[PDB]
């Protein structure tokens, strides 16, 4: 059920990686420090790719309008975003990053 995304070391701290999924909506994996999180990649306010946004701590800022979400809860942190992001639990085992298939 889980999806093997990459090696933890493939991502530098404070970076975002877009994870495409054939026949499904892309996801975004965020590395906050040594912690990893994942949400839907598409901003809920438009068509922007959050992985092309700015990560500040555990808050991802959308590149289009400055809307933002807490990558841990998926809840909006800044307007104009109002619809919560889909969250996917992530677990790191043996230096490998896995992202749940569902929210």
């Amino acid at each position: 059920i889980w999806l093997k995304v990459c090696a933890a070391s493939d991502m530098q701290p404070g970076t975002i990686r877009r994870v495409n999924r054939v026949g499904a909506a892309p996801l975004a994996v965020y590395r906050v420090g040594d912690q990893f999180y994942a949400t839907e990649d598409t901003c809920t306010h438009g068509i922007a790719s959050l992985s092309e946004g700015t990560l500040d701590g555990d808050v991802i800022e959308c590149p289009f309008h400055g809307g933002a979400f807490n990558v841990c809860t998926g809840m909006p942190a800044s307007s104009p975003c109002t619809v919560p992001l889909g969250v996917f639990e992530v677990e790191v085992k043996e230096g490998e990053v896995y992202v749940a298939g569902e929210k």
């Binding site: 400055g66 933002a68 942190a77 800044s78 307007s79 104009p80 619809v83």
Partner: protein, 388 residues
């Protein structure tokens, strides 16, 4: 949020009220009469600065914000209701359900990921006494009774009225209506003379300040209002004098009316009895934008059967409407307009010099400040803002 902070700082007794230039959010407001909106004939209007669309589907009313989520155009520029339960924007065909505002389809791109993922703002709408009320607020609405004067909803109360747009902020209208001494402007009223009404020029206050009004902080339904009791211990003034000489006189009619006057949130006045011993007047001053309001007038009379209500309707159209609602209240309209300049820069809220009968207005300002359910802001109109 709507007024210079320096001014709000000065008016400590009622800062929220002074700030509420656009009106109070989270309250029910009447905007039209039931007969003004027919099946499948969407109607536009602006309330608390927001453009809205109301439609009747299978007899029931629905209200959607008249602003497409996509590029912000008013859907009403070119209405396209392609199915009974939906409305399609004329620009890129984003389609919304009247029932819940959900973006259910997009004709220009049936594979869009936005479908089923966005919702156009909707507002509760309820019809009562032939009047259309909209809850301009968020979340589950309170009972309509909370925002209406006592008895307006009585089972036997037959309501008839008139509505129009008046060029003045809603508050100026409220204060003029509840102003005990403003009756002076009605001294030459045709209604007073023809309907032989007793109408003083004003009142010489009696008793203490606390006795001048009666604030209702709660009802079985939660309404909030203030009663004008200046006539309880006050002395009616029928002779107007200057330097001791008589220059004017009040109306010595036999009919005693308006012994019961109260103002209620969100801004509706009840005058009983008026304009005749067997009737009551309920009027709302609904905020449209910062400079205008709907002057929603209604006259109520208890009627037990279709015979009484039929007779009432005839009396209303031939007498009460033209002689009272228009003949009497028309003077209130220009009085409100006359106060616009002084309060337009918000400085009138600081420079006004009040006198005794204004205790009623002060009581209302404080009540409104303490119990309104929210201050409407320009941000509510364009889109609430917040930066983490």
């Amino acid at each position: 949020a709507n007024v210079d902070e320096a001014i709000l700082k000065r008016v400590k007794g009622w800062a929220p009220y002074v700030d509420a230039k656009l009106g109070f959010r989270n309250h029910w407001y009447p905007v039209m009469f039931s007969k003004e909106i027919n099946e499948g004939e969407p109607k536009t209007l602006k309330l608390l600065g927001e453009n809205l669309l109301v439609n009747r589907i299978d007899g029931k009313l629905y209200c959607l914000k008249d602003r497409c989520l996509h590029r912000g155009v008013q859907l009403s520029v070119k209405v396209e209701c392609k199915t009974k339960s939906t409305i399609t924007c004329w620009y890129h065909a984003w389609t919304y359900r009247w029932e819940d505002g959900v973006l259910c389809d997009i004709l220009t791109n049936p594979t869009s990921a936005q479908i089923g993922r966005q919702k156009l703002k909707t507002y509760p709408v309820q019809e009562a006494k032939g009047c259309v009320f909209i809850y301009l607020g968020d979340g589950d609405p309170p009972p309509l009774a909370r925002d209406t004067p006592p008895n307006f909803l009585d089972d036997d109360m037959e309501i008839l009225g008139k509505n129009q747009i008046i060029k003045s902020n809603w508050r100026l209208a409220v204060e003029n209506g509840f102003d005990p001494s403003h009756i002076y402007i009605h001294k030459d009223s045709i209604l007073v003379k023809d309907n032989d009404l007793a109408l003083p020029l004003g009142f010489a206050p009696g008793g203490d300040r606390k006795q001048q009004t009666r604030v209702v902080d709660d009802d079985v339904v939660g309404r909030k209002g203030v009663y004008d009791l200046i006539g309880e211990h006050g002395v009616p003034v029928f002779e107007g004098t200057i330097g001791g000489e008589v220059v004017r006189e009040g109306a010595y009619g036999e009919k005693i009316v308006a012994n019961d006057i109260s103002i209620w949130l969100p801004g509706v006045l009840k005058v009983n009895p008026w304009p005749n011993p067997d009737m009551m007047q309920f009027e709302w001053y609904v905020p449209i934008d910062e400079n205008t309001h709907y002057y929603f007038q209604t006259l109520g009379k208890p009627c037990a059967n279709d015979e009484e209500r039929k007779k009432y309707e005839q009396e209303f159209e031939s007498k009460w409407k033209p002689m009272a609602l228009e003949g009497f209240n028309n003077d209130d309209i220009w009085a409100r307009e006359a106060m616009v300049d002084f309060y337009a820069d918000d400085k009138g809220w600081v420079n006004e010099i009040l006198f005794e009968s204004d205790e009623a207005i002060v009581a209302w300002r404080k009540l409104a400040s303490e119990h309104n359910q929210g201050i409407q802001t320009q941000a509510h109109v364009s889109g609430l803002e917040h930066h983490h």
